[PDB]
């Protein structure tokens, strides 16, 4: 029915388990008191590469084929340079194949150095989408590579779903998962998984109000991407949801809570200060959601809530004051 | 052997406090394993109530010590510390439904007053002198039928800190060594008593800033040699010298002492923030720095499984830049 099934999530877990961390679920008395709930924190910030994206990236490297005539990917290529590019480069290195990140000439020096530092090769393009698409396609063809989208690639979605397999095992009495949403690869994989295994468990999305395409899409009942690149401290969720993740989110996600920039900032600081966990602000989105006014509408029966702390890739130098 | 505490005291402490403290997790780091050549285990006391291990000793003290009054239960706790000890004692007081008072000189920063009240201690003012601090504390202690608790020499505190090792030995059955940052040595001594009682083959190693190397010097000379002057160190939680109660334990039951430079501390702290995503305070960086240090490299390969106590996470976020 959807672009992935529970069976695909299971193949993904089999595919990646030898190379990822089964990250712990931690608790906090303080956050319990603030929210009125029994919170559990799935610590993807301690995952290899500093985010959960290694799950989808590794699955993609281990399951996609470059061509009808070649079963083994000979390189990986992506346009995404942040947590996905880092995760995809690590997956490529594990598999002994090169990684290419397609990068506009106009990217900051910092960005270019960062990519080099995580061991990928840069391929330069023009800022135009016509240029990016041409270059990424050329690279993929020349290298016999796989292009691995950060959130719409089914093997990626299936990989991200493995988080929910762990959560359900680590937290048998869980009532709800709270998941930050950008392109919805994580949200959709988790929704498929939870609704296949234990549909009484709620799946809730958390999103910056400044980038609220997932909320608007669920509100309208059709895919409504951001018209303009969003401004948010939550840099990992600036993608819009897309054609593969939207149908899953429409049908299998119970609710979407949006949060202000101030709420994201305050929740991130709270996690740093009270839990001593170096989350990136994007991972504060889910915490903000559970602290927000609208989350009080959630039935008191929904007591045990697992929030995914999705990443820890923060540049601390410039992060304190943001 | 015989010392100010025995393992029996640690067992009592565990029963006294276990219902109110976190059994903190032990985490691991692939990168740190590779950098040291060891299997490291990180006992995460930065996740403990109040943000440090000190609630163990503080709660044990609040539940064990008696005031100088009619009724056997303390009606208050009075403190000098606005740091980890003070915050831990304040929380232990809240659990027991008794006021915590902190004696503060008239001229302490308005910032630090706000911070004191943030954790719920009641400020009693004194004049800025060691005479006035002491005498106000005594008065308040007596008038409130309260108790005072030394941060590292009090036997109830030392016994409480030992509870760390009880957990570690359960959590890491094959542990070969514990690495523990040392200031006053309450934690190091409580750990040593526990380890040597339960599994004496496990090594107990102390870690300390080279800028405050009283523990190293003491062990070298075979006598208690406190720091000549108050040390300057980024490791603000280990500025105290070892005292008369912890020294004998440390002399007899601690296997070795590793010192680390300020740069080694700062670097180890940053490494933990960046690579483990754990907001340790620099004092907790001391033990990591120790296992990374050249001198530690020379330690026998049979000592494979090493548990480092990440002792606290109470760090000023804004001041994190430039440490
Ligand atoms: Ca969005
Ligand atoms: Ca010292
Ligand atoms: Mg239930
Ligand atoms: Na192809
Ligand atoms: Na499974
Ligand atoms: Na599709």
XYZ file of C-alpha atoms and ligand atoms in Angstrom:
651
model
C 0.000 0.000 0.000
C 2.860 2.404 0.809
C 6.368 2.826 -0.561
C 7.673 0.656 2.304
C 6.202 -2.145 4.388
C 6.971 -3.488 7.833
C 8.746 -6.355 6.036
C 11.139 -3.745 4.579
C 11.826 -2.275 8.035
C 12.728 -5.753 9.220
C 15.030 -6.393 6.254
C 16.644 -3.035 7.077
C 17.245 -3.989 10.706
C 18.823 -7.299 9.614
C 20.882 -5.363 7.053
C 22.271 -2.703 9.420
C 22.306 -4.170 12.970
C 25.976 -5.263 12.880
C 27.126 -1.684 12.242
C 24.894 0.592 14.309
C 24.405 1.192 18.014
C 21.302 0.048 19.831
C 21.109 3.453 21.489
C 19.869 3.687 25.098
C 16.566 5.035 26.296
C 17.161 7.525 29.121
C 14.788 9.202 31.542
C 14.518 12.471 33.434
C 12.564 13.186 36.625
C 12.658 16.906 35.875
C 11.114 16.607 32.412
C 8.522 14.176 33.807
C 7.431 16.851 36.312
C 7.339 19.647 33.734
C 5.235 17.782 31.169
C 2.936 15.740 33.409
C 3.951 12.596 31.472
C 6.325 9.624 31.832
C 8.943 10.457 29.206
C 11.530 8.201 27.596
C 14.342 9.537 25.432
C 15.675 7.424 22.562
C 19.218 8.672 22.302
C 19.960 8.723 18.570
C 22.425 11.529 19.387
C 24.742 8.695 20.492
C 24.280 6.833 17.171
C 27.287 6.411 14.849
C 27.869 9.699 12.923
C 25.940 11.634 15.591
C 22.423 11.063 14.186
C 19.986 8.291 13.324
C 20.569 8.907 9.586
C 23.188 6.130 9.517
C 20.237 3.703 9.693
C 18.653 4.719 6.367
C 22.063 5.467 4.759
C 23.517 2.041 5.562
C 20.326 0.273 4.496
C 20.437 2.131 1.179
C 24.088 1.236 0.600
C 23.366 -2.409 1.492
C 20.153 -2.855 -0.533
C 20.021 -0.541 -3.592
C 21.418 -1.526 -6.997
C 22.979 1.060 -9.389
C 21.607 -0.578 -12.536
C 19.659 -3.555 -13.921
C 23.010 -4.968 -14.979
C 25.006 -4.331 -11.791
C 23.922 -5.523 -8.333
C 26.730 -3.812 -6.357
C 26.812 0.011 -5.849
C 30.245 1.336 -6.766
C 29.845 4.756 -5.137
C 27.253 6.829 -3.291
C 26.064 10.308 -4.330
C 23.894 12.872 -2.577
C 23.000 16.570 -2.664
C 22.616 16.666 1.141
C 25.746 17.771 3.033
C 24.616 17.733 6.654
C 23.706 14.737 8.839
C 22.707 12.730 5.746
C 25.974 13.373 3.881
C 27.935 12.526 6.989
C 25.913 9.315 7.546
C 26.075 8.343 3.878
C 29.853 8.844 3.737
C 30.320 6.621 6.813
C 28.031 3.942 5.255
C 30.089 4.128 2.006
C 33.355 3.818 3.945
C 32.044 0.716 5.779
C 31.235 -0.800 2.389
C 34.605 0.232 0.856
C 33.079 2.498 -1.847
C 33.636 6.242 -2.465
C 31.113 8.942 -1.479
C 30.398 12.099 -3.504
C 28.525 15.123 -2.200
C 27.247 17.469 -4.900
C 27.828 21.005 -3.647
C 26.995 24.472 -5.097
C 29.989 26.755 -5.738
C 28.192 29.162 -3.375
C 28.451 26.902 -0.300
C 30.230 28.382 2.797
C 33.914 27.517 3.244
C 32.925 25.860 6.546
C 30.553 23.466 4.726
C 33.228 22.489 2.164
C 35.792 21.782 4.887
C 33.199 19.823 6.913
C 32.444 17.461 4.006
C 36.141 16.932 3.344
C 36.659 16.261 7.047
C 34.076 13.470 7.071
C 35.873 11.863 4.127
C 33.628 12.477 1.127
C 34.683 13.926 -2.234
C 33.061 17.205 -3.298
C 31.639 17.598 -6.767
C 30.867 21.246 -7.525
C 27.732 22.432 -9.309
C 25.928 25.688 -10.096
C 23.363 26.914 -7.484
C 20.609 26.027 -10.007
C 18.555 22.843 -9.641
C 19.103 22.174 -13.358
C 22.861 22.199 -12.591
C 22.653 20.136 -9.393
C 20.477 17.485 -11.053
C 22.778 17.351 -14.067
C 25.918 17.011 -11.958
C 24.480 14.469 -9.497
C 23.151 12.385 -12.389
C 26.447 12.623 -14.265
C 28.398 11.588 -11.145
C 26.004 8.697 -10.423
C 26.335 7.445 -14.020
C 30.132 7.880 -14.332
C 30.879 6.224 -10.976
C 28.259 3.460 -11.283
C 26.917 4.902 -8.039
C 23.581 5.013 -6.222
C 21.960 8.381 -5.578
C 20.634 8.272 -2.020
C 17.919 10.825 -1.184
C 17.870 11.936 2.503
C 14.170 11.207 3.136
C 12.193 10.013 0.056
C 14.308 6.942 -0.858
C 12.292 3.861 0.318
C 15.388 2.043 1.553
C 16.204 5.156 3.632
C 12.665 5.330 5.086
C 12.790 1.588 5.890
C 16.144 2.093 7.670
C 14.846 4.960 9.796
C 11.869 2.779 10.857
C 14.310 0.531 12.781
C 14.301 3.169 15.541
C 10.721 2.106 16.347
C 11.644 -1.612 16.503
C 14.141 -0.748 19.235
C 11.798 1.631 21.054
C 8.967 -0.913 21.236
C 11.457 -3.439 22.683
C 13.085 -1.006 25.108
C 9.808 0.523 26.281
C 7.132 -2.230 26.336
C 4.524 0.036 27.931
C 5.073 2.971 25.517
C 1.861 4.878 24.662
C 3.242 7.248 22.017
C 6.338 8.131 20.021
C 7.192 11.785 19.365
C 9.304 12.306 16.249
C 10.742 15.545 14.744
C 9.768 15.873 11.097
C 11.549 17.362 8.115
C 11.294 15.336 4.939
C 9.449 12.676 7.017
C 11.746 9.724 6.316
C 12.120 9.080 10.025
C 8.445 9.869 10.776
C 7.162 7.612 8.001
C 9.439 4.651 8.751
C 8.464 4.851 12.430
C 4.747 5.210 11.572
C 4.819 2.113 9.312
C 6.586 0.165 12.033
C 4.456 1.192 14.991
C 1.153 0.796 13.138
C 2.176 -2.669 11.865
C 3.189 -3.912 15.313
C 1.082 -2.076 17.888
C -1.399 0.364 16.314
C -2.784 1.391 19.732
C 0.518 3.244 20.198
C 0.256 6.858 18.984
C 2.722 8.367 16.509
C 3.075 12.132 16.805
C 5.124 14.526 14.682
C 6.878 17.623 16.011
C 7.716 20.450 13.678
C 8.964 24.121 13.781
C 6.045 26.485 13.176
C 8.494 28.409 10.977
C 8.687 25.403 8.659
C 5.231 23.933 9.073
C 4.606 22.115 5.738
C 3.813 18.804 7.518
C 1.192 20.477 9.710
C -0.219 22.391 6.714
C -0.288 19.186 4.607
C -2.110 17.226 7.285
C -4.469 20.145 7.824
C -5.343 20.494 4.127
C -5.234 16.754 3.394
C -2.742 17.090 0.505
C 0.995 17.628 0.109
C 1.743 21.325 0.649
C 5.564 21.872 0.725
C 7.128 25.085 2.039
C 6.832 27.714 -0.708
C 10.148 29.261 0.394
C 13.284 27.922 2.189
C 12.363 28.146 5.917
C 14.193 30.109 8.606
C 14.640 27.964 11.699
C 17.276 27.088 14.298
C 16.181 23.482 13.580
C 18.546 23.128 10.614
C 17.977 19.373 10.202
C 14.244 19.754 9.477
C 14.233 22.402 6.739
C 13.301 19.852 4.046
C 9.592 19.580 3.154
C 7.835 16.227 3.276
C 7.689 14.613 -0.137
C 5.719 12.304 -2.400
C 6.899 9.043 -0.750
C 6.596 10.048 2.909
C 3.404 12.104 2.613
C 0.866 9.216 2.092
C 2.266 7.395 5.137
C 2.127 10.541 7.245
C -1.407 11.338 6.037
C -2.732 7.907 6.997
C -0.605 6.592 9.853
C 0.504 9.653 11.897
C -1.906 10.543 14.679
C -1.122 14.250 15.122
C 1.404 17.034 14.401
C 2.475 19.602 17.015
C 4.207 22.775 15.859
C 6.636 24.741 18.037
C 8.038 28.269 17.951
C 11.736 29.129 17.597
C 11.697 30.260 21.245
C 10.140 26.935 22.289
C 12.810 24.995 20.367
C 15.563 27.083 21.927
C 14.173 26.688 25.467
C 13.661 22.921 25.108
C 17.182 22.431 23.723
C 18.702 24.414 26.617
C 16.599 22.453 29.099
C 17.910 19.151 27.706
C 21.515 20.419 27.800
C 21.190 21.770 31.339
C 18.921 19.232 33.038
C 19.743 16.041 31.139
C 23.399 16.872 30.218
C 22.803 15.622 26.659
C 24.357 17.581 23.789
C 21.408 17.423 21.424
C 21.313 19.528 18.309
C 18.468 22.099 18.302
C 16.628 20.013 15.695
C 16.380 17.224 18.334
C 14.910 19.792 20.773
C 11.869 20.050 18.463
C 10.283 16.887 19.876
C 10.981 17.944 23.449
C 9.427 21.370 22.711
C 6.326 19.629 21.286
C 5.755 17.649 24.442
C 6.201 20.841 26.533
C 3.891 22.869 24.322
C 0.393 24.088 25.138
C -1.298 22.066 22.391
C 0.201 18.799 23.691
C -2.077 19.175 26.748
C -4.915 18.103 24.389
C -3.371 14.622 24.304
C -5.488 12.230 26.381
C -4.191 11.559 29.935
C -4.322 7.867 28.944
C -1.268 8.576 26.763
C 1.138 8.462 29.696
C 4.380 6.799 28.549
C 5.843 8.854 25.714
C 9.099 8.184 23.918
C 10.734 11.226 22.321
C 13.389 10.587 19.672
C 16.508 12.697 20.390
C 17.426 12.522 16.745
C 20.944 13.973 16.630
C 23.918 15.497 18.449
C 25.818 17.176 15.613
C 26.011 20.656 17.088
C 28.793 23.203 16.667
C 28.982 24.232 20.292
C 31.098 27.355 19.627
C 28.193 29.279 18.076
C 25.312 27.346 19.601
C 24.922 28.633 23.197
C 23.685 32.010 21.926
C 21.900 31.393 18.644
C 44.067 -1.965 58.648
C 40.871 -0.250 59.790
C 39.556 3.107 58.579
C 36.833 5.729 59.115
C 34.487 3.467 57.148
C 34.174 -0.170 56.217
C 32.295 -1.878 53.416
C 29.472 -2.540 55.902
C 28.941 1.240 55.923
C 28.690 1.290 52.125
C 26.090 -1.519 52.243
C 24.071 0.532 54.775
C 24.413 3.660 52.590
C 23.085 1.762 49.561
C 19.964 0.718 51.481
C 19.635 4.235 52.891
C 19.738 6.027 49.521
C 18.833 3.623 46.711
C 15.113 4.559 46.693
C 15.993 8.220 45.979
C 18.980 8.188 43.605
C 19.375 7.134 39.965
C 21.111 3.862 39.173
C 23.064 5.715 36.506
C 23.833 3.970 33.167
C 27.230 2.892 31.935
C 27.819 4.021 28.346
C 30.610 3.256 25.827
C 32.466 5.054 23.007
C 34.005 3.367 19.957
C 36.249 6.400 19.326
C 37.520 6.548 22.896
C 38.240 2.808 22.891
C 40.395 3.311 19.787
C 42.188 6.385 21.188
C 43.200 4.547 24.370
C 43.455 0.945 23.115
C 41.141 -0.184 25.955
C 37.505 -1.142 26.476
C 36.177 1.890 28.313
C 32.980 2.055 30.321
C 31.645 5.433 31.410
C 29.683 5.501 34.671
C 27.390 8.428 34.068
C 27.105 10.241 37.393
C 26.540 13.442 35.359
C 22.987 12.013 35.000
C 22.620 11.632 38.788
C 20.105 13.722 40.711
C 21.511 17.279 41.088
C 23.958 16.659 38.229
C 26.709 14.997 40.287
C 27.450 11.900 42.368
C 27.430 14.028 45.547
C 23.735 13.313 46.282
C 24.824 9.813 47.327
C 27.006 10.993 50.218
C 24.760 13.976 51.001
C 21.581 11.907 51.249
C 23.360 9.214 53.269
C 24.534 11.928 55.665
C 21.116 13.587 55.933
C 19.552 10.182 56.696
C 22.270 9.072 59.152
C 23.658 12.110 61.011
C 21.929 13.467 64.144
C 21.726 17.130 65.367
C 22.625 18.455 68.826
C 19.013 18.603 70.045
C 16.153 16.651 71.647
C 14.774 15.008 68.486
C 17.081 12.637 66.608
C 16.144 13.872 63.116
C 17.829 16.984 61.606
C 15.371 19.866 61.230
C 17.650 21.669 58.767
C 20.876 21.434 56.811
C 23.301 24.349 56.648
C 25.948 24.816 54.003
C 28.931 26.885 52.898
C 28.902 25.429 49.363
C 27.067 26.842 46.381
C 28.756 24.110 44.282
C 28.002 20.392 43.736
C 28.105 19.602 47.448
C 25.773 22.481 48.355
C 23.314 21.633 45.576
C 23.361 17.957 46.582
C 22.786 18.734 50.275
C 19.929 21.128 49.339
C 18.181 18.366 47.347
C 18.727 15.812 50.122
C 17.062 18.360 52.464
C 14.104 18.794 50.098
C 13.617 15.003 50.017
C 13.434 15.040 53.814
C 11.119 18.076 53.962
C 13.607 20.242 55.912
C 14.996 23.701 54.952
C 18.496 24.053 53.515
C 20.401 27.198 54.470
C 23.468 28.507 52.708
C 25.656 31.054 54.469
C 26.692 33.766 51.999
C 29.010 36.816 52.515
C 27.239 40.193 52.267
C 29.168 40.991 49.081
C 28.637 37.855 46.958
C 27.528 38.647 43.341
C 23.823 39.353 42.764
C 24.145 36.774 39.956
C 25.231 34.019 42.380
C 22.438 34.896 44.825
C 19.908 34.292 42.032
C 21.695 30.992 41.253
C 21.676 29.896 44.918
C 17.919 30.458 45.225
C 17.410 28.683 41.898
C 18.168 25.334 43.516
C 16.113 26.281 46.563
C 18.597 27.016 49.309
C 17.701 29.769 51.773
C 20.364 32.486 51.979
C 21.651 33.438 55.425
C 24.078 36.389 55.225
C 27.436 36.745 56.957
C 30.259 39.287 56.821
C 32.960 38.348 54.216
C 35.513 36.662 56.526
C 36.335 33.053 57.545
C 35.490 33.952 61.154
C 32.038 35.288 60.241
C 31.291 32.459 57.777
C 32.127 29.798 60.424
C 30.285 31.539 63.265
C 27.109 32.318 61.299
C 27.020 28.660 60.135
C 27.379 27.425 63.742
C 24.635 29.768 64.968
C 22.192 28.860 62.194
C 22.994 25.145 62.605
C 22.304 25.279 66.322
C 19.265 27.591 66.192
C 17.640 25.445 63.485
C 18.548 22.134 65.168
C 20.172 21.333 61.810
C 23.279 19.390 60.714
C 26.409 20.240 58.767
C 27.988 17.777 56.365
C 31.629 17.892 55.258
C 32.011 17.418 51.449
C 34.589 14.627 51.584
C 35.820 13.723 55.127
C 32.437 12.909 56.724
C 32.201 9.078 57.116
C 28.518 9.093 56.029
C 29.563 10.953 52.838
C 32.466 8.615 52.095
C 30.242 5.549 52.579
C 27.598 7.064 50.287
C 30.137 7.683 47.500
C 31.198 4.029 47.715
C 27.747 3.141 46.323
C 29.096 4.167 42.900
C 31.415 1.141 42.896
C 28.689 -1.273 44.035
C 26.724 -0.400 40.896
C 29.757 -0.392 38.603
C 30.783 -3.911 39.685
C 27.243 -5.130 38.891
C 27.064 -3.204 35.621
C 30.497 -4.224 34.343
C 31.105 -7.776 35.738
C 34.457 -8.082 33.974
C 35.735 -4.642 34.945
C 39.510 -4.609 35.519
C 39.918 -1.054 36.866
C 38.013 2.001 38.009
C 39.355 5.480 37.257
C 38.155 8.137 39.685
C 38.924 11.912 39.815
C 40.197 12.927 43.259
C 39.817 16.151 45.227
C 39.146 15.631 48.931
C 39.047 11.887 48.124
C 35.583 11.090 49.550
C 34.637 9.456 46.278
C 38.022 7.825 45.747
C 38.072 6.453 49.282
C 34.509 5.196 49.255
C 35.221 3.515 45.919
C 38.474 1.938 47.152
C 36.829 0.485 50.284
C 34.077 -1.015 48.148
C 36.223 -2.342 45.356
C 38.839 -3.895 47.631
C 36.176 -5.524 49.786
C 34.218 -6.979 46.865
C 36.751 -7.710 44.107
C 40.332 -6.801 45.211
C 41.817 -7.865 41.882
C 40.098 -4.832 40.293
C 42.483 -1.849 40.187
C 41.478 1.496 41.666
C 43.178 4.378 39.923
C 42.924 8.061 40.870
C 43.164 10.943 38.417
C 44.092 14.492 39.354
C 45.243 17.784 37.774
C 49.004 18.206 37.801
C 48.245 21.730 39.084
C 46.766 20.215 42.280
C 48.852 17.078 42.694
C 48.611 16.592 46.498
C 47.272 13.068 46.050
C 50.178 12.130 43.742
C 52.750 13.666 46.093
C 51.188 12.089 49.173
C 51.313 8.589 47.636
C 54.911 9.117 46.446
C 56.115 10.260 49.889
C 53.936 7.859 51.863
C 52.530 10.745 53.949
C 49.737 13.348 53.652
C 51.119 16.366 51.769
C 48.212 18.822 51.158
C 48.513 21.522 48.467
C 50.696 24.371 49.796
C 48.376 26.979 48.233
C 44.758 26.845 46.858
C 45.282 25.408 43.336
C 44.368 27.102 40.067
C 42.574 24.579 37.866
C 39.707 24.342 35.376
C 38.764 21.239 37.401
C 36.925 23.347 40.022
C 35.442 20.299 41.792
C 38.835 18.809 42.774
C 40.517 21.835 44.355
C 40.350 20.369 47.865
C 43.267 18.452 49.282
C 42.824 14.955 50.622
C 42.185 14.962 54.372
C 42.972 12.896 57.457
C 39.947 10.585 57.019
C 40.407 9.764 53.333
C 44.215 9.684 53.277
C 44.770 6.266 55.035
C 42.258 4.576 52.738
C 43.874 6.142 49.680
C 47.368 5.242 50.934
C 46.524 1.554 51.377
C 43.786 0.727 48.844
C 44.434 2.901 45.764
C 46.670 1.255 43.139
C 48.029 4.341 41.373
C 47.539 8.041 40.768
C 47.622 9.739 37.361
C 48.096 13.494 36.964
C 46.988 15.466 33.923
C 47.788 18.934 32.625
C 45.222 21.681 32.224
C 45.468 21.243 28.463
C 44.870 17.503 28.812
C 41.769 18.188 30.929
C 40.362 20.803 28.552
C 41.030 18.545 25.571
C 39.489 15.453 27.200
C 36.395 17.445 28.199
C 35.925 18.765 24.646
C 36.418 15.244 23.254
C 33.643 13.905 25.490
C 31.285 16.767 24.519
C 32.015 16.365 20.806
C 32.293 12.605 20.488
C 30.061 11.246 23.248
C 27.544 14.158 23.358
C 27.730 14.097 27.169
C 27.833 17.483 28.911
C 30.476 16.646 31.517
C 31.951 19.386 33.658
C 35.770 19.813 33.315
C 36.280 18.111 36.698
C 34.739 14.974 35.185
C 37.144 15.401 32.250
C 40.015 14.653 34.639
C 39.502 10.904 34.610
C 39.109 10.750 30.834
C 42.296 12.770 30.425
C 43.978 10.231 32.707
C 43.177 7.226 30.548
C 44.260 9.167 27.427
C 47.575 10.279 28.988
C 50.996 8.892 28.019
C 51.575 7.470 31.513
C 48.335 5.479 31.273
C 49.477 3.972 27.944
C 52.142 2.079 29.884
C 49.577 0.334 32.118
C 49.491 -3.460 31.638
C 47.311 -4.795 28.744
C 45.557 -7.235 31.121
C 43.797 -4.181 32.526
C 41.449 -4.057 29.550
C 38.008 -3.164 30.886
C 38.262 0.263 32.497
C 35.387 2.146 34.087
C 35.785 5.911 34.268
C 33.520 7.817 36.612
C 32.056 10.806 34.790
C 31.490 12.490 38.113
C 29.384 15.537 37.197
C 27.675 17.648 34.546
C 27.214 20.953 36.380
C 28.914 23.267 33.914
C 28.149 26.902 33.055
C 26.948 26.732 29.440
C 27.720 30.343 28.542
C 31.263 29.973 29.908
C 31.743 26.773 27.860
C 33.496 28.776 25.137
C 37.153 29.163 26.207
C 36.397 26.885 29.201
Ca 8.415 21.030 7.991
Ca 44.613 17.007 44.251
Mg -1.203 2.196 28.150
Na 21.805 4.086 -11.914
Na 12.834 -6.552 15.492
Na 5.848 6.897 -4.411
